[PDB]
Amino acid sequence: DHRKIGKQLDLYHMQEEAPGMVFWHNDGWTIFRELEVFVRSKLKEYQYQEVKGPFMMDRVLWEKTGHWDNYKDAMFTTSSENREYCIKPMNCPGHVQIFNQGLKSYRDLPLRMAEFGSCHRNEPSGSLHGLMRVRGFTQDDAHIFCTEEQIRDEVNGCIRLVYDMYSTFGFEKIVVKLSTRPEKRIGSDEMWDRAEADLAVALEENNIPFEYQLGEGAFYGPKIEFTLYDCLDRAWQCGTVQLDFSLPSRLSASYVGEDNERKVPVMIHRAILGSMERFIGILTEEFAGFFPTWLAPVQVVIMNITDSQSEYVNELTQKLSNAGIRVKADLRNEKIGFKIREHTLRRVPYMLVCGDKEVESGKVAVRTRRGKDLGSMDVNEVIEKLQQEIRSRSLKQLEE
Amino acid sequence: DHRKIGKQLDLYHMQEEAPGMVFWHNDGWTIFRELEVFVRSKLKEYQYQEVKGPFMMDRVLWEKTGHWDNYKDAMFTTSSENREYCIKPMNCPGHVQIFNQGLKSYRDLPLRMAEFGSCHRNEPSGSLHGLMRVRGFTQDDAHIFCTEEQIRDEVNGCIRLVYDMYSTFGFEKIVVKLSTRPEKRIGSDEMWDRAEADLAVALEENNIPFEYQLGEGAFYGPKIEFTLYDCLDRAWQCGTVQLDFSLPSRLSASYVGEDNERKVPVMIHRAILGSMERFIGILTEEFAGFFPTWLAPVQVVIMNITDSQSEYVNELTQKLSNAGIRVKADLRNEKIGFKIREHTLRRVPYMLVCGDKEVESGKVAVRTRRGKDLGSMDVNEVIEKLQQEIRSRSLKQLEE
Ligand SMILES: O=C(O)c1cc(S(=O)(=O)Nc2ccc(Cc3ccccc3)cc2)ccc1O
Ligand SMILES: O=C(O)c1cc(S(=O)(=O)Nc2ccc(Cc3ccccc3)cc2)ccc1O
């Protein structure tokens, strides 16, 4: 259960005065920020722009998209100078506004536009659940503006990216669903037929088995949903790929084609992790708090036995910190076995013990959060290997 | 004027349907993110935690702090399930909530807690100006919880950090103001006397000349204000250091002292850049769009003359990109002179031209956005020097 593990590792907390709002503590924010860096490296590789849209836009714009009519109950609203604003539940309209600055042509397409977009949705309080279902969350979101001829490759690209990213966390159980047209929707039947068919053909061409999930699509288009499970085998939508022939038209998006006529771009929506919040909840439960070294808030703790070795521990801490490792010293006058138990409960990958022998030899005794005693080793070697474990974003520690 | 420069370099835009809200385009967001990385490197060096508080909190909490009575008209409110929430105009209360999780002692102090905190303030629309005065902005904010004996060193730390960071951008107009007690305020007169005296002593010990700005302090404490000027020599509050003996008490913050009695922590508020938005407006005008290489959205553009060299350009682009440089290839079927002009107008620091001779020799012809022609040079040398210019965050290029 990620809520208990979350308290025990001091990752985050929640309070009545802000239901479904996460207060990220230093250590949870470290995880979050590490996820950002990882995502960003993929955005670079798969050629995405990164942008940032505003939190609020005029209610008039949300009426034009169909959100007001189809999504009103999940929207926070506010006002200023006799005008109403909606806090964004989604990043797409913001992205279209950016697309609409400056003349576009087919030469600019496909245009891939990513955002770590803070969304707010007024979910019923009784549906809230730790980090999985919150009122304020951050999507690793993007929108791809493309031609009709480009849809197949771009949808394939999103799917490639899901499996690429998910294999770093080592996911076996990726159940895939295709969520079809809901009762309340925009666009014609033909648009929905085409959009559902293309997502389905994409999955089939990639040899991905999936089930239909009738009526669980968005009002602006169907979804491929990559489903992950928690400790009670509850299904949680994480990765999501959507196809939309409606919003660009409504927000007057256009580009000049080769013909030289105005054409409306197709819009692909996708989020790989889903939200950072939910994904971290899934990870917390998947790993039972044993985060891979690259995600771990504290990667190394260095301990002395007596005051005799505190000097050496501080030098070592400095050294590791300079090598770019998240490290802490534990100099408390506590029995070493007491210290090991505490940092094991905090899921610290590596615990370095410094007795007189380690001092004398410039060595360090290594223990892991799994109770494994790896013996004395040369410091430079431990540093080099920690860096390799981090750089490769390895699932498994030294040995395993 | 940063608004015109902003349009012509595609950094950001603004629209009527979101007054005082910035839409960051890819290139503006790159600058913003580079400022984050820079700030973060300083947070590491000066030993800050980094956290993230929620956007919304219950109106009741804002009444407790005195914001509802003293700051109401600048606050956006929304509601859910018959409760009212405020969109945070500040990060301090959020930080205190985090501080209040888990028992604290003097051993934890000083506790430095930083956030890139998205603030929203309902400024009068007639006061809005480009990026300088907006409704939605991101403070490079922090709050330092400390004892009374620690105030001097911690305030000195904030001041050291301002001049440290500002010298990277090369500021030689740092006018400093000391903003004293406003008419509407919390805390006693003795608290205000002490707080004004300490800020004044701090400025004088650092040999900083300043003017008083009587009555322009915050309701929760006096401010040191570091003032930067725009192209029309208008004064803009950027860096800010505040001293607060009142908010922690109101939010029931406490720690166990050495004596072993409950004490209320002193709180120092500070923002070095101020907001990212304002600071970027200042920089845009200060540099007239010629950002230092480390800040530049695109650092290098590589161009071919004919199709003959496209292969070589792609290999080179790959190489530079892997060396960690923000690089683009320009393979359009355009005259080279046309291409160079375009990237010069966009203030790309370096333009690499590849003709048959560069191909044959594994060399590259380098020019700058200033029209400086550096001749043909070895590629590895160009890479090495670009990396040095970036790592050192130097103001001046290869050339000047
Ligand atoms: O275009 C969009 O607005 C968009 C919407 C979704 S979604 O709302 O269908 N998918 C989604 C699923 C889970 C999360 C995490 C989460 C956490 C709490 C509540 C709701 C969602 C976020 C998005 C996904 C990608 C998009 O570009
Ligand atoms: O923690 C702080 O530093 C802090 C600072 C302020 S401040 O408003 O005095 N500092 C400041 C200076 C410039 C900007 C940029 C800005 C401000 C208003 C509108 C637009 C941009 C932001 C904050 C208010 C509350 C705080 O907790």
Residue numbers in the entry:
A (entry chain D), B (entry chain A): 2 to 401
Relevant lines from the article:
Attempts were made to co-crystallise these inhibitors with PfThrRS to enable experimental structure-based drug design; however, no crystals suitable for X-ray analysis were obtained for the Plasmodium falciparum ThrRS isoform. Since crystallisation condition protocols for the E. coli ThrRS were available, and since the ThrRSs of the two organisms share 94.7% sequence identity in the binding site (within 3 Å from ThrAMS; 89.2% within 5 Å; see binding site sequence alignment in Fig 14A), attempts were made to co-crystallise the identified inhibitors with the EcThrRS, and use this information to guide compound optimisation. Crystallisation experiments resulted in the determination of the crystal structure of the EcThrRS-7q complex, which was resolved at 2.08 Å resolution. Structure analysis confirmed the docking predictions that the compound binds in a threonine-binding subsite and that the salicylic acid hydroxyl and carboxylic groups coordinate the zinc ion (the heavy atom RMSD value between the crystallised and docked pose is 2.54 Å). The binding mode of the zinc-coordinating phenol/carboxylic acid group was identical when comparing the experimental crystal structure and the docked model. However, there were minor differences in the conformation of the sulphonamide group. The sulphonamide group was slightly twisted with respect to the docked pose, and besides binding to Arg651, it simultaneously forms interactions also with Lys752, Gln766 and Gln 771. The discrepancy between the binding mode of the resolved and the docked sulphonamide group was the result of Lys752, Gln766 and Gln 771 side chain mobility, as the conformations showed by these residues were different from those in the complex with ThrAMS. Structure-activity relationship study was supported by the crystal structure of the complex of a salicylic acid analogue with a close homologue of the plasmodium target, E. coli ThrRS (EcThrRS). Despite the availability of the structural information on the ligand binding mode, targeted incorporation of hydrogen bond donors and acceptors to mimic the adenine of the substrate did not yield compounds with substantially improved potency.
